[PDB]
Write a protein that binds this ligand. Structure first.
Ligand SMILES: Nc1nc2c(ncn2[C@@H]2O[C@@H]3COP(=O)(O)O[C@H]4[C@@H](O)[C@H](n5cnc6c(=O)[nH]c(N)nc65)O[C@@H]4COP(=O)(O)O[C@H]3[C@H]2O)c(=O)[nH]1
Ligand SMILES: Nc1nc2c(ncn2[C@@H]2O[C@@H]3COP(=O)(O)O[C@H]4[C@@H](O)[C@H](n5cnc6c(=O)[nH]c(N)nc65)O[C@@H]4COP(=O)(O)O[C@H]3[C@H]2O)c(=O)[nH]1
Ligand SMILES: Nc1ncnc2c1ncn2[C@@H]1O[C@H](COP(=O)(O)OP(=O)(O)CP(=O)(O)O)[C@@H](O)[C@H]1O
Ligand SMILES: Nc1ncnc2c1ncn2[C@@H]1O[C@H](COP(=O)(O)OP(=O)(O)CP(=O)(O)O)[C@@H](O)[C@H]1O
Lengths: 265, 390, 380, 265, 252
């Protein structure tokens, strides 16, 4: 009955937030879960580009109000329900938290046939990023094996812990050439957090770096369905199996979040 | 329940350990350092083997190679040394892989604890039982303890548990207000009704009115749908208002109107609806000074102060910490997490902390050390620097 | 305790097996054989230094009767535990009673330690407490049971592990019922000798028949108008069990040698730790007595199910020390978690005995983890 | 000599914006002049992490008025006066345009920039990025051969044209595995712009994918100094001349832009 | 050198005649016409033909400056004036004291801005925000707009006193679509930029010239410059005709 929402974040760009979010969406679709995929990067669209969708009406038409949220849904490849975000529209680039809410609560009306929702939160630590992170109970940080990414993810955790006090984070390593260096990356993040913060980073696995994911990107298709027999594909299948093992949210939190009425009932 | 592996080349040690395993209520599969493959072939899969109890290693490649082969057989398999603990010669990963080291003659409680931990991490690492039911780090049975500081809280609980009027709660951040609200809701008439918690400080002030009452399209900027607000979701239920002093001035008169007449409105339209929402508020500051400053209105304060509830900081109930330290750990092993054991020095240092954050940061620390160094032998050293008090 | 277990067993394999079995538990054991048991047994300080005598498979000539007579000459009060074989039917009646349990080849932990506790009772008898406090869910369910039962007046059944605190629940029900002024009487059938349970419960008759050596009335007139809390009703033998059913259902008794029937109005509260419906399947328990007794079930939880209560119990236990000026020990957090993580088979009695022993060992001291006994010791 | 300020943009995250800014600034510094790098990601400062420098006082202090601007000029490699900003501070991310303009005007105090100042704009098309590109005289776009990067760059171009009518742009290719790859990416982006809008974009160069950059980032040092003899370092060196010496006959106009005091006279 | 434009048609002849009409006096010069008609070069060439020649020219495009920020950059502010001010800098009058001030897009002036500019014109003095100092400077002001004023006052959102103060010397701008015949020559002016800025080269064929002449050209000269530079940049050294013109520019 409750809907698990996974916000794929990390602050540092290029770690693979959009691609990992799309791949997880199609992975849970293939496992047998009806999946919705929302591009929280409302200023710039990347989700519909990777999946080849070319919608005729997007979240902007929702926001300045010439339609509802039924009309913008896309039945993309892999049986996914995509909620595209506008690219280059003035009404979308910067939003007050009031309009971000006006989007968030209205997004809960379209919840008839949902099992898992994947939120592609935009890069950085902007207001929209923080609002969408707090709106999702399952926050997964994609971390690459570069100190810039390490410190930027640390900055994001510091922002979300010093200000709003959220400590749970699911660390997913990316661009790891060996299974051991992913654990090494997790140890580096753990050392930094211990020296500075008090948070509970939970290792969820490594996504190996291979040209299959990239060549799927240029072919404008998800690597899960474009190359279902690749090392990254099998490792991400295992990651999706672990994702299904994540317990469902049971209770709503004080702040705004997706599907409050689904959780409260 | 499954089986156990005894790869020990010592005839006496393996024999007595098999006798002990048969005593405690589970079967065993005695093996040597090299011919364990043929014995393990008798099992259907790795699930039929719970954990292994390493003894003496005499084959080629050493205990490191033996453990590499065993992890190749099952990567998610706990390791139970007996007789000789891991020295400072093995690699760090191999050192950490070991669940625990026994000390012959085998000790009762340590052996059952090791087996219970082994089966806990075995149940945790497989793909059965599907997903569970996640809960917040502060959403545990935090009302445990033997101090005056928590007995007063429970006394005011029982005092207000038989009413339905608005309640007011005071105490520092992370002191356990959510648990108080949930307990009050569960022990009231509207138990089956919804429990909607909202904290006015987490969400900005501009949209707080939209979140509380609800809006409709065409009479609200940024409005998309004729949403029913959290007050509507609280019909027949309770609205737990945390950090109540961050509501703007008009929010105070609006709350006064909804509390007195039991009816509210939706912003943008001149329509009224009546509900029976129970208002349980919680703040972490001094309202007796905020009223004088000019932020909290008098009437709302006097309407919420019908039944106050004051918490106490963790540092003022130090002799409860151990209890919480247990009640968290059990929770973790009964949640999708393994079990952690502490040394005397670790907990003794943990009870010396001033706790600038209350129980919430204690739970955060417990979870972070559980998922940082799991199934280990964590003592005072493994604790973070701040918590290490000597 | 500090007492050791004698292992008189001719089978070398069984001897060493049981030796390591008991050395697992932490109790001190010594391996002995019939050819050398004499001098090693004489090497102990006294006959009371041994908790009991463990007898395995015996292959020595002359049978076990001679060994039993020799042990009887050694000590009159000496429990015997058979391992690996059932109770023989050719042994004399006066010798089979000392065999405490007809244990098969070394059994599970719970059965063995329950037999050891029975042997402890055997030792002590031949030689209370303010529980029901806390906010654990188990104690809350128990309290809900008391609220559901208190407004009525009928038989009450308590199920829970041995020594878990049923007496305090019986006292609570007695003081929350209409019989507050009436006497409240607890009787533990397990701790009473089988040959003397009839005299203890039904009473005494002077010169009526053989065996009348005690002059003391039974609990019938002790329990009149109040609560009779019969603990360990499983150990109730079948003839005395049907007598108890006659006393219960008819609410009346009759003195042998007369024709007048005397009425009693007592609230019966049975409490036991052994499963009763499995005993029904085995046929050694009456059908209707269970049905009448099990109308108001109180599923008393073990200490492990209400671990959050444990510390609040120690304080109360420590409080019992402060009132009587009987010492004052203060547990640190380390010992609190060390005791909380324990399984606690003898749930409350073991905790109380541990507190007493720690008090005697370290008066006015901070009880840490090092001062704890080995069985309660828990570390990282 | 009117100060020419270059800002590095591209919208898409992880393209190399902070990395290319740091390395290019080091390139100009090693090729004469005296650069004064600034990072416009006021809440996510990665220039110091990539350079290994420890900022005693950051730009958040001068935003709050705690210290003057000249106080936060921190010397680093190559004789570069880095101006680090705050890390993990949301209050330093989304500022009102008045505060951004006050920062731009506060830069007028420094008068030791030999026609060089590199701005590291944050990912996205938010208010800060546009406010900084309007203040800059050269806007450098870094994009990678991936359709999402093309979409984000085109969205930024569309926003700038539609609202502020920017006309001249510089295109730089990053993470290009072949020299043909960067030119193909530029051709695709200019094809999209030609199909939809009217904006002229200028070619700059290409940054090949080299593991030397990864190893240098691991060493907490910029790739220009850690491995100066490398293909990536040579690419940055080549980009140095293209950036530095193209607008030799500069004619300083006037609007809301950096160093307007020097541009007037 | 400077930014140069040339023409031969009757409209630009009237433009130069009317410019020379007012070039003999120094007062507020108000320019009316559509946007992108070349008002900046008009102001700069008026200044270059005015008394001020060594003085600097300060342009201010109000469409490129936020409304709340217009007075901040124009009048100036001290270090401590509000929450966003962290440095004392002089206003744009001081930077060009003794030069020529150009103020484009006067349409969106708020009422405080209008009264402040009227005060600057009348008493020849001003004051920085968050301060009481009264400072006087001398400058020649050329204000410009894209909307016709008469309707803008008719809406009631333009102060009539400021309207009359600025409109003492009205200026009429001629959009290019009425003077298409010199566009080719005007094109030969813009290639001079390619020969003056060194950014490439571009040519126009006769068919391309006549095709371009038919185009409506709303934002005449700014759009013309943008189009020619964009065509040059997309493919330099190529021949420009009719088909390869992006869109609507091949009206034939
Ligand atoms: N000390 C401690 N033990 C904990 C905690 N959470 C879970 N447990 C233990 O884990 C058992 C199973 O919990 P579950 O899987 O959620 O399965 C639970 C759940 O489905 C439900 N349940 C029980 N208590 C609650 C509660 O407070 N809230 C909700 N929403 N469900 C509950 O009933 C089932 C059985 O509950 P129990 O009989 O209590 O059995 C519980 C209890 O023994 C905790 O915070 N502290
Ligand atoms: N999944 C899971 N979560 C658990 C469990 N036990 C506790 N929790 C979590 O801890 C919160 C507070 O538990 P509490 O202090 O016992 O406070 C509890 C307790 O007073 C009462 N309650 C809930 N279930 C039971 C139950 O089965 N028996 C009793 N006696 N009380 C219950 O309701 C209060 C509020 O419950 P919630 O709103 O659910 O809020 C619960 C829930 O979020 C458990 O076994 N499983
Ligand atoms: N798991 C992975 N393995 C290998 N390369 C990966 C990868 N995830 C991402 N990449 C690379 O990074 C590129 C960008 O990925 P993605 O679009 O998910 O980034 P992102 O969304 O984190 C940045 P932004 O938030 O700015 O859009 C991919 O096209 C590919 O080149
Ligand atoms: N030529 C190249 N070869 C390999 N990796 C490269 C690269 N250029 C950039 N990267 C990688 O791109 C990531 C980000 O680089 P850097 O931090 O220097 O700037 P950036 O501007 O791309 C980040 P953001 O987009 O978040 O501002 C790092 O993992 C870096 O190693």
């Amino acid at each position: 009955h409750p809907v698990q929402v996974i916000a794929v974040t990390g602050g540092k760009g290029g770690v693979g937030k959009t691609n990992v979010s799309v791949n997880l969406a199609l992975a849970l679709a293939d496992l047998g879960r009806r999946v919705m995929l929302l591009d929280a990067a409302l200023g710039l669209a990347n989700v519909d580009v990777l999946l080849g969708l070319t919608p005729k009406r997007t979240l902007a038409d929702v926001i300045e109000g010439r339609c509802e949220l039924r009309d913008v849904l896309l039945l993309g490849p892999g049986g996914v329900r995509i909620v595209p975000a506008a690219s280059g529209t003035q009404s979308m680039v910067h939003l007050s938290p009031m309009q971000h809410a006006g989007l968030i609560q209205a997004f809960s009306d379209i919840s008839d046939n949902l099992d898992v929702l994947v939120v592609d939160t935009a890069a950085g630590i902007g207001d929209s990023v923080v609002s969408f992170v707090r709106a999702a109970q399952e926050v997964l940080l994609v971390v690459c094996d570069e100190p810039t990414s390490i410190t930027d993810a640390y900055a994001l955790i510091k922002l979300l812990n010093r200000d709003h006090g959220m400590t749970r984070f699911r660390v997913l390593a990316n661009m790891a050439h060996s299974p051991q260096e992913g654990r090494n990356l997790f140890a580096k993040l753990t050392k930094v957090t211990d020296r500075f913060l008090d948070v509970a980073l939970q290792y969820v696995g490594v996504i190996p770096y291979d040209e299959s994911v990239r060549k799927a990107v240029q072919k404008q298709r998800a690597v899960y369905e474009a190359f279902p027999r690749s090392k990254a594909s099998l490792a991400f299948k295992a990651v999706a199996q672990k994702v299904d093992s994540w317990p469902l949210p049971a209770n709503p939190r004080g702040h705004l979040e997706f599907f409050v009425e689904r959780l409260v009932q | 329940e499954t089986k156990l592996l005894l790869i020990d080349d010592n005839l006496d040690r393996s024999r007595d350990l098999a006798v002990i395993l048969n005593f405690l209520g589970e079967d065993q599969l005695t093996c040597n350092s090299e011919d364990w493959r043929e014995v393990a072939a008798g099992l259907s899969n790795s699930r039929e083997a719970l954990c292994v109890l390493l003894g003496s290693v005499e084959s080629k490649g050493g205990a490191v190679e033996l453990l590499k082969q065993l992890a190749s057989w099952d990567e998610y398999l706990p390791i139970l040394l007996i007789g000789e603990p891991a020295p400072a010669d093995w690699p760090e990963e191999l050192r950490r892989r070991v669940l625990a080291s026994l000390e012959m003659p085998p000790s009762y409680n340590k052996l059952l604890d090791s087996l219970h931990r082994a089966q806990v991490y075995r149940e945790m690492y497989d793909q059965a039982r599907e997903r569970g039911r996640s809960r917040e780090p502060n959403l545990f049975r935090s009302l445990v303890g033997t101090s005056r500081a928590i007995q007063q809280v429970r006394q005011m609980m029982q005092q207000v548990a038989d009413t339905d009027a608005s309640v007011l709660i005071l105490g520092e951040s992370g002191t356990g207000k959510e648990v108080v609200a949930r307990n009050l809701h569960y022990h009231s008439k509207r138990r089956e009704g919804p429990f909607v918690p909202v904290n006015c400080g987490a969400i900005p002030a501009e949209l707080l009115e939209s979140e509380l009452f609800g809006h409709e399209k065409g009479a609200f900027t940024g409005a998309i749908t004729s949403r029913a607000g959290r007050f509507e979701l609280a019909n027949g239920g309770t609205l737990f208002l945390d950090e109540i002093g961050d509501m703007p001035l008009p929010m105070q008169v609006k709350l006064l109107r909804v509390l007195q007449e039991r009816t509210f409105e939706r912003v943008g339209s001149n329509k009224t609806q009546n509900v029976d929402v129970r208002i349980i508020a919680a703040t972490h500051k001094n309202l007796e000074k905020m009223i004088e400053d000019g932020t909290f209105r008098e009437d709302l304060y006097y309407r919420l102060n019908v039944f106050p509830i004051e918490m106490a900081p963790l540092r003022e109930r130090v002799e409860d910490i151990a209890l919480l330290l247990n009640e968290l750990i059990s929770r973790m092993e009964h949640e999708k997490r393994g079990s952690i054991r502490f040394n005397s020095a670790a907990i003794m240092s943990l009870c010396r902390h001033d706790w600038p954050g209350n129980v919430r940061e204690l739970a955060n620390l417990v979870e972070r050390l559980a998922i940082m160094h799991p199934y280990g032998v964590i003592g005072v050293g493994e604790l973070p620097k701040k918590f290490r008090h000597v």
